[PDB]
Amino acid sequence: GSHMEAQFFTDTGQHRDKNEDAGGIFYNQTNQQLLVLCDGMGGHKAGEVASKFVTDELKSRFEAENLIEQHQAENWLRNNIKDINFQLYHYAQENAEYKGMGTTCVCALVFEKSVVIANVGDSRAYVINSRQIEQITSDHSTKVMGTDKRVSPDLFIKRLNFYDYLLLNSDGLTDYVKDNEIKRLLVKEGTIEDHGDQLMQLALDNHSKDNVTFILAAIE
Ligand SMILES: [Mg+2]
Ligand SMILES: [Mg+2]
Ligand SMILES: [Mg+2]
């Protein structure tokens, strides 16, 4: 039943026709929480097919699980990301309008005092408090799911103590909003919707040329 107060935000942006970002907040049979964010691309403008494909697979597989304790989480994420990459790759190869499509994926399994994060691509995971903002993941840039039948995701475990927020985001945010801008926005008093709306408007005010998507989660 480990979960944070969290919300998913996305915007096509003022310089894009479609939204090829995807993601969500999902719950398994014991109401554990999984945060998922995907930045799609490629194919004949089929980026949204890839990002939604991975998001839907993670949701379906997670909702089918009973209990994933912290010591099982790295292997669960790693093996399921590998399997989803395999499925997406061959799906793309079997459809001429999809061939070449792929997507980033950053996702987080939530536990009591920790989070387990898997990452493929240049979407990001951050933890933030009043004095620092730490990018947990490392941009693979760009390796994405679905363009090869093999993938090697990075796995991270981060203790949530003494941090205030967990942030997952596509590059539409951090390509145009600096880390310190994000941290100083979050140090203010306000709800998740307060910070989420302000952070989206800030990305738009910086004239992001990309889809902008993020999950903001409050750490107790
Ligand atoms: Mg994209
Ligand atoms: Mg990028
Ligand atoms: Mg992007």
For 197-210, give the DSSP string: HHHHHHHHHTT-SS
Integer Cα distance of 59 and 24 in angstroms:
8
Ligand with the closest atom to the CA of 48: 1
* Gap from CA of 172 to ligand 2 centroid (Å): 7
Q: Contact at 8 Å (CB) between 200 and 212?
A: yes
Q: Provide the annotated binding site for Mn(2+).
A: 20-21, 39-40, 122, 165, 171, 175, 186, 188, 195, 210
Residue 78 structure tokens: 């790693």
Inter-CA distances, 200 with 5, 75, 107, 204, Å? 18, 33, 20, 6
Q: Provide the annotated binding site for Mg(2+).
A: 20, 39-40, 122, 164, 171, 175, 210
Look up the CATH number of the domain holding residue 56: 3.60.40.10
Token pair 């061959």: residue: 90
Q: Which residue segment(s) compose the domain that 211 sits in? A: 1-220
The type of residue at 97 is: E
For 53-83, give the DSSP string: HHHHHHHHHHHT-S---HHHHHHHHHHHHHH
Partners of 169 in beta bridges: 124, 214
* Gap from CA of 171 to ligand 2 centroid (Å): 5
* Gap from CA of 170 to ligand 3 centroid (Å): 6
Resolution for this PDB entry, in angstroms: 1.8
Ligand with the closest atom to the CA of 173: 3
Residues 6+ apart with CB under 8 A from 208: 13, 14, 15, 172, 173, 175, 176, 177
Q: Identify the experimental approach.
A: X-ray
How many domains, the chain? Answer: 1
